[PDB]
């Protein structure tokens, strides 16, 4: 029964998920002056040309665009990663206001939203096994700021009416996630966790430096979604972000000078 409200939100999660107070929790604030350039970091390899999207689902916490991950079709390699990570889903976190919504922050700055492209390490065979491993997942995080529309996001925005409430899904085939990327693949990286329960410490975070711009109308449509199921009292799906957690014994590395 965890959520983002006053009585079940991030401050409560530790009671059911004690790892909430663990040693490599996410998100974190990215202090740009303290992050260190690592010249040995390889360029990211984002190979999404064969991506096969299947479905979009309102799961009561966010909406997920799901992919066929039963073959190497859309994969993330390189950067800090060893091996091949398959794209399984992407989703967003966003705010009730344009000045909040991202999970990671940059010099304490909050963006309007944050995109998470979730990948799992193929050496572990399936996603469920991968989340039990310290190098099981790689999540590519991309900040959203409000300005010009993102044309590649509009197909997502268009379908949200059909998945307004928790448990609703819709076909969502032939979507190209490459349309959600910024120009640059410069990034920060650090070892972290899932940012929602079960908060498993299985994620290599790769956070892009360059935000994408989305329009006020696009993010407004995110905010019309519901946390609740159909026929239940309406609770707008907004502010579904976890705040920055203590960095503890971690260094954030930068791919760029
Ligand atoms: C088919 C889709 C199943 C996905 N299953 C993933 C899942 O159960 N939970 C989950 C929680 C948080 C993140 S985050 N916010 O760190 O990226 C990503 C995934
Ligand atoms: Na506008
Ligand atoms: Zn997320």
Pocket mutation for ligand 1, best pick of 118, 136, 142 (most atoms within 8 Å of C-beta):
118
In the numeric block, which tokens belong to residue 167?
């448990």
Please report, for residues 67, 144, 175, 220, the alpha-carbon distance to residue 230 in angstroms, rounded to integers and kept in the order given. Answer: 25, 29, 26, 20
In the numeric block, which tokens belong to residue 86?
């398959």
Omega within 30 of 0 (cis) for the link into 27: yes
| CATH, residue 188 | 3.10.200.10
Residue 140: burial class (beta carbons within 10 Å; 0-12, 13-18, 19+): buried
Contacts of 40 (CB under 8 A, 6+ apart): none
Tally of structural domains, the chain: 1
165 assigned to a ligand binding site: no
Residue listed under structure tokens 């609740």: 228
Nearest to 199 by CA among 43, 33, 10, 7: 10
- Say how far apart CA 36 and CA 47 lie, in whole Å: 27
Under DSSP, is residue 139 helix (H, G, I), strand (E, B) or coil? Answer: strand
Ligand 1 pocket residues where CB is under 6 Å: 64, 66, 88-89, 116, 118, 139, 194-196
Which residues are known to be catalytic?
61
Contacts of 88 (CB under 8 A, 6+ apart): 66, 67, 69, 118, 119, 120, 127
Method of structure determination: X-ray
- Phi, psi (degrees; rounded to nearest 5) at 75: -130, 155
What separation in Å is there between the alpha carbon of 33 and the centre of ligand 1? Answer: 30
Give the single-character DSSP code of 27: -
81: number of Cβ within 10 Å: 19
For residue 207, the surrounding DSSP H or E stretch is strand 203-208
- Say how far apart CA 257 and CA 255 lie, in whole Å: 7
CB 57 within 8 Å of CB 163:
yes
Query: What range does the domain containing 34 cover?
Result: 1-257
- 91 pairs with which residues across the strands? 116
């Amino acid at each position: 029964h965890w959520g983002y409200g006053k009585h079940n939100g991030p401050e409560h999660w530790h009671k059911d998920f004690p790892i909430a107070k663990g040693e490599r929790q996410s998100p974190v604030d990215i202090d740009t002056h303290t992050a260190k350039y690592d010249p040995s970091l390889k360029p990211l390899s984002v190979s999404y040309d064969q991506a096969t999207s299947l479905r979009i689902l309102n799961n009561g916490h966010a909406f997920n665009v799901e992919f066929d991950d039963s073959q190497d079709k859309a994969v993330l390699k390189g950067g800090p990663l060893d091996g091949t990570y398959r794209l399984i889903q992407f989703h967003f976190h966003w705010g009730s206001l344009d000045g909040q919504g991202s999970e990671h922050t940059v010099d304490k700055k909050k963006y309007a939203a944050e995109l998470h492209l979730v990948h799992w390490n193929t050496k572990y065979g399936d996603f469920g096994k991968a989340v039990q491993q310290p190098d099981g997942l790689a999540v590519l995080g991309i900040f959203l700021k409000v300005g010009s529309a993102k044309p590649g996001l509009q197909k997502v925005v268009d379908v949200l009416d059909s998945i307004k409430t928790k448990g609703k899904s819709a076909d969502f085939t032939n979507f190209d996630p490459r349309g959600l990327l910024p120009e640059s693949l410069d990034y920060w990286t650090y070892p972290g966790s899932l940012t929602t329960p079960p908060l498993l410490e299985c994620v290599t975070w790769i956070v892009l430096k360059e935000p994408i711009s989305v329009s006020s109308e696009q993010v407004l449509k995110f905010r019309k979604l519901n946390f609740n199921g159909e026929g239940e009292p309406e609770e707008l799906m907004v502010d579904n972000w976890r705040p920055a957690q203590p960095l503890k014994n971690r260094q954030i590395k930068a791919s760029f000078k």
